[PDB]
Write a protein that binds this ligand. Structure first.
Ligand SMILES: [Mg+2]
Ligand SMILES: [Mg+2]
Ligand SMILES: [Mg+2]
Ligand SMILES: [Mg+2]
Ligand SMILES: [Mg+2]
Ligand SMILES: [Mg+2]
Ligand SMILES: [Mg+2]
Ligand SMILES: [Mg+2]
Ligand SMILES: [Mg+2]
Ligand SMILES: [Mg+2]
Ligand SMILES: [Mg+2]
Ligand SMILES: [Mg+2]
Ligand SMILES: [Mg+2]
Ligand SMILES: [Mg+2]
Ligand SMILES: [Mg+2]
Ligand SMILES: [Mg+2]
Ligand SMILES: [Mg+2]
Ligand SMILES: [Mg+2]
Ligand SMILES: [Mg+2]
Lengths: 66, 88, 70, 117, 104
RNA sequence: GCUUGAGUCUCGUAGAGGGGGGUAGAAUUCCAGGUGUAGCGGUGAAAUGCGUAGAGAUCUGGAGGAAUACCGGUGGCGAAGGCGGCCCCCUGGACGAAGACUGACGCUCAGGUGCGAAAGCGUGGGGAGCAAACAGGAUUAGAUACCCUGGUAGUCCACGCCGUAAACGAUGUCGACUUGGAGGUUGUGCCCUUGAGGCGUGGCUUCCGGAGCUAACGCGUUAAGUCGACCGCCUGGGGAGUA
């Protein structure tokens, strides 16, 4: 069940970090859309914004890198 | 692609009521204006074989329209290639 | 699977919790896959055989459930 | 030997061997023991039983440093993935952390060719 | 002409020269008929991984409507200023003037 | 002359479409230094190899190349070859919604021209990992192999050449017509959006199957059904796609 359809959002912004922590796991991997239920238009916009915020240190790449 | 105020500026120059937009004189010049533009794209990008295929579509689509006009009206054909800068 | 062990908790409760966090991260499934090179032919040939495996068990085995075995 | 209170276990498991290294929390080795150096050779040294004496002979070599807490960082796959840390509780050590530090490339270098056995 | 979003990360020792940096990078836009639409300052923020042996940086957001030649010129201003480490200048379709979820 | 074929204009959409330039994280290798001490690596088992001139393990610092985990999906884009981090710049196509506009401007195409995986060639760089050749160690009756330790062309880059693949859907392009069922993906309209609902309508797409066709296998509105237009091709096996 997709939550970005219920919100009706049009662009998953990479700066909304309280949202983007739901869509990574403990190790920081991007969670598959089969378990979150994200619609395929939004899962492409989800991973595009998580990779934009790993560049800007908002999110980690892996849980181990120091 | 050709900008918004460029296709509105060539329709208003070669069309009848600034509204026809699909006449043969209008369509040739909008293809000519892009072929003339894309010469600078491919003097920089010679390995761009996928978008040159879109350029060679406009050339074949221009020749089919100039061959249409020439027997439909020799007088409008002769004045169209005299103004755009074309040789045939 | 970086696990800290919490206070007042035994070792077996941290050992079996470590045998769970290493399977969500895909640790063992990643190392065996990157051990040898798999061709771009071979990676695409098995990616379609499993899609046939998933779909010819879903729709083509329900037939025996519509029918009966005894 | 300056008595250090705590440290880290580094268990490098591979499919043929297991190297156990007790260190401190800054990365300085104090003593080590491997599965093949336990009197095990060839096929015997790549079992889970052969890798508990790797942890036993290594705990027996860091007795003079006086280590109480000892976290474990497991690297690599292997049969001694589990039984090397079972026998590190048997030396009386309370576990602090258990870490998994297998190196995962994000499709970097090209791995060797498949074996046509 | 073209809407952009910039966000540049400042070394935490030169964090007092950021009100100087925002005033020079505002005026470089407006000297070329460029709307500077919103402007934020996120404070010293904890990093998620250490870039170049430090764990903290000072983040600035800046939304601009400039010609693209004074935007490329701003990218090579961040390239040689050693106070700024990372920047991510990124084109936008419409204009945004909302508050951030971390000005919030 | 006409407007349904073909095209043009306005407004949006989705996308590893193409060319160019930056940058990021993880990992391998090497180099340097600390700690440490007798083994490491590999195999069915070993041995060659590396180690007491201090290896392997572990920690720190530097260098360099190549590729982009997760997302990722009988998902997407492209004429085909094919295309995967993220960011900017230049650019080709498809598609949808209503509304005007030109008025058969169309389809196919021998010769011709362009594009065309990988390997290979010429010139100049680059070279971390992998690896034809070559080398040693095994295996074996032998082993010019399989397996092991190494290792050079090559793989990468710029610009030319080559012009071939099981280059395949083993199915030439274009238009028309003929029962259905369950999905993916991308639009758009309308009904109380009373929520992702219900209800129509376009593009592309996976799986099943009816009539029909088929030597059978199977195909089956994305035809291998029923047609029309044009092109390519074939005529027993070998000799031979050879002289
Ligand atoms: Mg066009
Ligand atoms: Mg090997
Ligand atoms: Mg009409
Ligand atoms: Mg008319
Ligand atoms: Mg020909
Ligand atoms: Mg090549
Ligand atoms: Mg060469
Ligand atoms: Mg060369
Ligand atoms: Mg070399
Ligand atoms: Mg070899
Ligand atoms: Mg052929
Ligand atoms: Mg192919
Ligand atoms: Mg094929
Ligand atoms: Mg054929
Ligand atoms: Mg069928
Ligand atoms: Mg027939
Ligand atoms: Mg047919
Ligand atoms: Mg047939
Ligand atoms: Mg010949």
């Amino acid at each position: 069940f997709c939550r970005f359809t219920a919100e009706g959002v049009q662009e998953i912004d990479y700066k909304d970090i309280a949202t983007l922590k739901n869509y990574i796991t403990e190790s920081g991997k991007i969670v598959p859309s089969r378990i979150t239920g994200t619609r395929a238009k939004y899962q492409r916009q989800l991973a595009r914004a998580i990779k934009r915020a790993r560049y800007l240190s908002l999110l980690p790449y892996t849980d181990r890198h120091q | 692609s050709l900008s918004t105020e460029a296709t509105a500026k060539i329709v208003s120059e070669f069309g009848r009521d600034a509204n026809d937009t699909g006449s043969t004189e209008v369509q040739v010049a909008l293809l000519t204006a892009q072929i003339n533009h894309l010469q600078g794209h491919f003097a920089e990008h010679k390995k761009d074989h996928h978008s040159r295929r879109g350029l060679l579509r406009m050339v074949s689509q221009r020749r089919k329209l100039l061959d249409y006009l020439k027997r439909k009206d020799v007088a409008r054909y002769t004045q169209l290639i005299e103004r755009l800068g074309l040789r045939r | 699977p970086v696990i800290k062990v919490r206070e007042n908790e035994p070792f077996d409760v941290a050992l079996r919790r470590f045998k769970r966090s290493c399977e969500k991260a895909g640790v063992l499934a990643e190392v065996r896959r990157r051990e040898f090179y798999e061709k771009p032919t071979t990676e695409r040939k098995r990616a379609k055989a499993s899609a046939v495996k998933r779909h010819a068990k879903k729709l083509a085995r329900e037939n025996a459930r519509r029918t009966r075995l005894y | 030997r300056k008595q250090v209170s705590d440290g880290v276990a580094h268990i490098h498991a591979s499919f043929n061997n297991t190297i156990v290294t007790i260190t401190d929390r800054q990365g300085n080795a104090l003593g080590w023991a491997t599965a093949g150096g336990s009197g095990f050779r060839g096929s015997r040294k790549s079992t889970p039983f052969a890798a508990q004496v790797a942890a036993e002979r290594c705990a027996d070599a860091v007795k003079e440093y006086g280590i109480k807490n000892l976290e474990v960082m497991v690297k690599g796959p292997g049969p001694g993935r589990e039984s090397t840390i079972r026998a590190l509780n048997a030396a009386g050590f309370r576990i602090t952390n258990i870490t998994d530090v297998t190196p995962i490339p994000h499709n970097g270098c090209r791995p060797p060719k498949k074996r046509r056995v | 002409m073209r809407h952009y979003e910039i966000v540049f990360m400042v070394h935490p020792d030169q964090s007092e020269q950021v009100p100087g940096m925002i005033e020079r990078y505002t005026a470089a836009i407006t000297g070329a008929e460029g709307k500077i639409h919103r402007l934020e300052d996120w404070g010293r923020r904890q990093l998620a991984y250490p870039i170049n042996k430090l764990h903290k940086a000072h983040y600035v957001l800046m939304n601009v409507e400039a010609p693209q030649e004074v935007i490329d010129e701003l990218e090579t201003t961040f390239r040689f200023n050693d106070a700024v480490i990372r920047s991510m200048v990124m084109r936008t379709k419409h204009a945004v003037t909302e508050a951030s979820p971390m000005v919030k």
